[PDB]
């Protein structure tokens, strides 16, 4: 019983590295992406200066 109980407890609480590792890698990508976009976004107002010329 203990063996099967332990196995069951695993399915509900253990971490599936395969799934989590991919999730971490995915999170970092979206992160670096957003950062690059954000940097590009901060430059948006710079346009006005030229119009003000």
């Amino acid at each position: 019983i203990n063996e099967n109980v332990n196995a069951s407890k695993s399915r509900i609480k253990d971490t599936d590295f395969a799934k989590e590792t991919t999730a971490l890698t995915k999170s970092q990508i979206l992160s670096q992406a957003s950062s690059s976009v954000l940097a590009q976004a901060k430059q948006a107002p710079n346009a006005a200066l030229s119009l003000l010329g």
Partner: protein
């Protein structure tokens, strides 16, 4: 279409990994007990005839 929100390829590999991992456990279990049928899921008929032969 390089995509970040989805990596179907990863899912495919993980699926086959889970297949291979479960396979190892089944084999290892059989090796340790020395018994091919250690549960009905292995062979219900065997479980029956083997228990009766036992």
């Amino acid at each position: 279409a390089v995509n970040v929100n989805t990596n179907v390829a990863a899912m495919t590999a993980q699926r086959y990994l889970t297949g291979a991992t479960n396979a190892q456990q089944t084999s290892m279990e059989r090796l340790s007990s020395g018994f091919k049928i250690n549960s009905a899921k292995d062979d219900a008929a065997g479980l029956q005839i083997s228990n009766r032969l036992n």
